[PDB]
Amino acid sequence: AEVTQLSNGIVVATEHNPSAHTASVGVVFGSGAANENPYNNGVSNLWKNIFLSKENSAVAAKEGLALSSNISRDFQSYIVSSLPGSTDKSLDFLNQSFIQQKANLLSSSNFEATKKSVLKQVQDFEENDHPNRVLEHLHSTAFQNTPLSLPTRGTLESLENLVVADLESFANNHFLNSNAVVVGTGNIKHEDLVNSIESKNLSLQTGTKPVLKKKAAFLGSEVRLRDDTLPKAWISLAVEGEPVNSPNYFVAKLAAQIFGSYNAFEPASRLQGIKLLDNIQEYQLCDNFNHFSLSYKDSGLWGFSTATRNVTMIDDLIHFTLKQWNRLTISVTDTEVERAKSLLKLQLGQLYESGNPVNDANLLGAEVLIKGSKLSLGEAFKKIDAITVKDVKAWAGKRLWDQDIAIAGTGQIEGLLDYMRIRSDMSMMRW
Amino acid sequence: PQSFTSIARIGDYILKSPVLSKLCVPVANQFINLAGYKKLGLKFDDLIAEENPIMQTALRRLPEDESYARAYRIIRAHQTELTHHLLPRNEWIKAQEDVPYLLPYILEAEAAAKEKDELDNIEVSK
Amino acid sequence: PQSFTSIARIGDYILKSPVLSKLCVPVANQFINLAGYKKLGLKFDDLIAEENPIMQTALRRLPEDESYARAYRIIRAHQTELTHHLLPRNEWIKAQEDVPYLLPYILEAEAAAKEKDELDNIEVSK
Amino acid sequence: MAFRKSNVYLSLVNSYIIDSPQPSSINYWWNMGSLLGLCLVIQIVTGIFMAMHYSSNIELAFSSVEHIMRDVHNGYILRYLHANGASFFFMVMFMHMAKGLYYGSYRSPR
Amino acid sequence: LTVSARDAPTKISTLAVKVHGGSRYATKDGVAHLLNRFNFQNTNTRSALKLVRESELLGGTFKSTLDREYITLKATFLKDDLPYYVNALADVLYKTAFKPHELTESVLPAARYDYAVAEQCPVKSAEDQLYAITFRKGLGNPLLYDGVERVSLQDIKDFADKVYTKENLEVSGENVVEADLKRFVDESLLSTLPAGKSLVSKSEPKFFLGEENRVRFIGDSVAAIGIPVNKASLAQYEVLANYLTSALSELSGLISSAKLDKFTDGGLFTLFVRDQDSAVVSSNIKKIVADLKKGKDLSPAINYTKLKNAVQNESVSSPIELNFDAVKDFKLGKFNYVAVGDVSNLPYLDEL
Amino acid sequence: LTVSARDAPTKISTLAVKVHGGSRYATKDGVAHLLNRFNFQNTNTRSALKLVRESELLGGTFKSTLDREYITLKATFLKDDLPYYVNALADVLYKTAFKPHELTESVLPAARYDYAVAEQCPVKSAEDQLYAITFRKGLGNPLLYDGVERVSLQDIKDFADKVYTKENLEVSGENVVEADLKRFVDESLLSTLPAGKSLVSKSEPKFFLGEENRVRFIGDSVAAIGIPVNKASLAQYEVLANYLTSALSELSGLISSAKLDKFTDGGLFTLFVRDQDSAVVSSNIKKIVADLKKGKDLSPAINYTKLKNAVQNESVSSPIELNFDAVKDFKLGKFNYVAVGDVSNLPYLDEL
């Protein structure tokens, strides 16, 4: 359904959809925040926020274009939403504003204003957004002293060393033709986008990007960011999960869906088909949990992230969640797997084919940057339907059963016991 | 321990049948008169052991006037049996007054628990 | 058990006298250096046993930055003595850093409790 | 909640042995109390297994202790275990009391 | 009973039954919120637990949504099992149990959580105050239930009988074959629903201008203006909202939010300025009101708001199809003003 | 430093130091309430426990009352120990501790209790609303601290240094030998207080008319009208308040309360109609405003209001000595309106 073609310097990937009323043209680079040091960290975030500058966005809004960017760990995108008949203007803006004439966004008193903006923004993140910085500290300890631990937001003390030379060095090292995929979603045809890229000479640069000397290695550890003036106690907890283009990728997503997510105040999330709720609903152990399967190019995390005000019964919540995790290795039933297949099919169908062509562009650029081709959703649903109970048990015995966990928590986590007592729950004594 | 759905099933089969009703209902009326819980100011739906989640659910869903009346009958029976006496025959529970008020709540919470169990133990036909 | 007001009284008498100061102050400085609580990162007002209502009052009345810093010094001393080492020599508490920070709060709560007891046991002169 | 917390007796074993929050910085002098419990279990068990053979009359006390030391199978093990475990009971008891005297475990709460 | 669908060659279908039964038609304050929370509870045949645990194996979820005007009952699912969800939405609309234990255990704790969530945000409080002082008893009803008037179970049942009627709702399915959808809406309980009148009034909703309200709030301080707009002047305030949101406007740093709410008879332009200290909010909204009373040229924002309105409009089921071509100039006339927060340091209406 | 006293042959004297330092002169919201709760705490010399436990054995108590204008420090005692209480009020005014542990442990919980109690009553909530929309930043300050702006300990010390000044207060002793009181106020710390300026302005408080506020409240429903009045028109609204409170009016069965708050430069006449259901409040206050806009003959209530004014006026130390003789007729003009409670069924200002 989607067409990818490698033109003479650059990779053009389009996903046409003639039912849509917008069209997004962008370029996705394959250097997210895993291509940083711990000292220039946040320079991808500064590049995002100077692509979304006021001086730069006024030029788009006069033409009728919308600017959207996104910073992930592997990739980063710079996508320009427009109307379907106005995509030559999108390519002209993406060419002039961001690729060629790059030294006008990087003027002083635009760099200074944006640096103050993301300093305020990252500090506002670090003081107020507690589940997401707990996932960030989970990455920072699960992958410590390795590329995949650097926060995509950037720290407050590495964003204060940053000058214009650092953004220029990140640009000349990572914004390359062998590193980019120019992406078109919405209702633009594949011949149309590649013709408009062959028409105006669209070249980023010619180099090859710096190879990271160390691959991402999971180190079982914990960080314990306790703060007793906070009302809840947020805690993420995860094992090393499967990377992208693993064979056990969809099995990892399925096993994340076996225990699903939860909201204790939505009365239809109470009635779900998860056996963990029979434990955690009686004394109201938590307010919400959600099991994720984060997959990156090198490694990834499989775990669950939760929040609770029942700060004296954290150990029952952790114990019951992990004794439910052992059931994947030993006694996962069939209807749990069929329920997880139906719900993972619904989740993946809502995720990939939603209404927004920006999110489709980010997903398309990531999947054809890492794999070189985007897997369609029919083949993905065939792969999900191929998963049996023995596949889930074998993946759980490989990845979950008696393996090193990574924990992270802030708030009132005095009720959280130490590492060895929690890691003793990853394997039971066969009862 | 016996489910109230089972008691209602057996009792409805006995009551709907014309032979079994005329054979077993007078014996049950004499059994209830000899049991003598009405001599302490009690209906039978107070006598049920309330220490299970089905009965606790039923007593939670019971409305407030029935709850206060049931509470008064229980404290009255405790004071009466403390004094080792009976209630005066003007204060006994009449037969028309011994109506099952807690039985629909019990049966509804029981059907909800049995549905919950059957859905926890399904096997999808694949 | 010894009241802090009494320790302040005797110590102020020693410090205000020129002979007792130059005789006993170096003995106390060498006593504090031999005591070795500074090698664990503790100031002395972390060492006072807090399990009494005067000390609980003073610790409630401590400002929050001193409370967080005292919490870190106590946890750091626990981890240091767990590992059976000391802190490195740049992490030792300096002499000018070892200020009595809890002492005005202790002495004020002590004066309040002594005044409360004295007014509990008064005898009006009639 | 867990069955180790919800039960009647396992909540006691849990709140005394399994979840009992000890400070992180205590040392091997805090092992003598558990060691005194071990000494008491040793003394009581070897005492019962010798009381099955001991006779308390004044003509049979010493003769019955020597019957334990000679005729009873592994009875020398039980008798020397009882006697030297009583000496070790009092060694570890003096260490428990002296570490209490030293570390101030007698003061205001305790 | 107006049924529509828009087919697509994808895998996920979303059915949506939209009833004109939001807070605007609420008889008591918050009865629409209690019915919206009462929607996917147990029916007379299938329980609420059986609905979730059957639809999870079939592969779709449910979501009842309360708007200012609509109650939207949405079902998102795998495409090949449409009639289960048509019949499920039919059972929800036709035969709900409405049990008192269901009111006191799930619906009222859920509504208390919803009111607590909306109470902690001062912008939602300012928007509800702005609605209630622009429109008094029509669209200015309370959105959520708070309990300042007792709404009993028979009130929720009576509102369900008033609202769930056959000329009042409209079935719309994104990524649904319309022939099979129109066949499956019949032979169901939507054809057995009563044919009550449509509650949509076609007249102008009788606004009031020059009103001002002040709320003391512990937290952030917002000051908000609100302009009631008619049907003819909807497009100009649409391009004004996307103008002030956009980077074309010098007021974009000062403005926390600016949006036009749209209905079939009018609308409300809301502008919110939110900060932590009240001197910042005072200086900001004084500058907004002054530089808007001076006229603005909204001709730059036309091509931008076409795209923004298209992005917003592909999600909704009934587009209004605005013009945006005849909009040239704006000049702020009369407007309603609310001030939530540190309310002794925020400006009043005559100081703007 | 104005010392006055009215001697009597009785056993109990009362001393009152009145500062012009109530909520009207508050710089932030609620500093006056926090200083009032900080009044009889410990000093630099004598503790607060020693104060109570000495004054009880001597035989008198203390009480600090916060008004809309004053802060009254009252002290009631057996007559023959007046210099103790003069020196105790002197110590409280001159040297209070203002300790941070006293702010967190006593003053903030006592003020939170006062605010919770006055929050539970919708009549005091409506009275505060009526003040705050009649006059804005002057008398329409909040009476009590609620925490919508951060009042710190240093702000209370600043407000106390501003307010506790020698030309700002007045010493008044009911049943006190006045020459002895003047000898005891001198040779004390009242004479060593700073001779600052008096905060009493002699101008009119710049009121506003026709304003309307609406506060949602779970419980009772009140609707309140309120008229700011000037110095020439004080007696008429006095005889109006005692007319509508009295049994001469036909509206006394409908009116829950009606009182005139008098100040040295004006007043506010506040009429509250309170009931449980909002339809009774609506019918009642529509009848009140209609039969007040139609004129009333306030001539019969004149001898009655001389009595009630003498009753109310013997307690206070500062009489205003109104006329009551030229008052004949009343006709309701413009007025400010607040509605608290079931606010979607209490009427608005247009419907009155």
Ligand code: HEM
């Ligand atoms: C509190 C723990 C105990 C202590 C400290 C203790 C101490 C002693 C000591 C010191 C002896 C003399 C040993 C020798 O020198 O031969 C002894 C003897 C004995 N004890 Fe105990 N005892 C204890 C518990 C028990 C109990 C509970 C019993 C009985 C069930 C018991 C039965 C005996 C017997 C039978 C002897 C006889 C001589 C021998 O066989 O050693 N003891 N005890």
